[PDB]
Amino acid sequence: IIGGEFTTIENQPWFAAIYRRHRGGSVTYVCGGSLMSPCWVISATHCFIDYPKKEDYIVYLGRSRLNSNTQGEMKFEVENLILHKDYSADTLAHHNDIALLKIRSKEGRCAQPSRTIQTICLPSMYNDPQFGTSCEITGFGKEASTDYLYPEQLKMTVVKLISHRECQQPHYYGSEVTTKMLCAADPQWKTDSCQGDSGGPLVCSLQGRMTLTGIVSWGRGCALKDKPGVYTRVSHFLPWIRSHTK
């Protein structure tokens, strides 16, 4: 996240940290995700596309730091990894970039609720906030586009939803953005999501609830003028989500 403040997971109790194991001893961060129900985390297909070996990923709930432990955290294995059929990427955008991970603990259980572990709410069929709404994004991704390391502390920031009309302006992303994506930026192009934030959540309040309105997906640069962050429009995938989380 470029800008933003540092937070603790108590302020984002639905955020999940997904890591990959390597033979040699290291586990590296892959992407963020969010918990929808006790056994399901939702993230982005492009985070698993180049290495769809579920047994090699570890999911952690209740984590405020990247490589150190947080008391209360829970570790899970990926029981089912569901990527999106029709996922495609072009020179920038990812289409249908949503993925689901069913988690199982070594004792055979799913997540349990605490002050550091909570689910986030889904929107209702194709229902979104109106452009202008302030939503917050969170994650462990880059702090500057030039960095080559990720922060050790969780970060958060607030961005506003913009319209498709504004995003599809030729000098923004033109037709690369579709009806199944959402764009969010800071009025003064100062804070944004960046590499390392993929799969994490875009939360806004809808009809009273804190709802997962978007998934960090792509963007040209980080916090660049007229280059909003693009998110997967969760409200348009509810059928798909249901199809697997039944």
Partner: peptide, 9 residues
């Protein structure tokens, strides 16, 4: 106690 989506405590 149990999950209540969207609630921070």
């Amino acid at each position: 106690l149990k999950f209540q989506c969207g609630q921070k405590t």
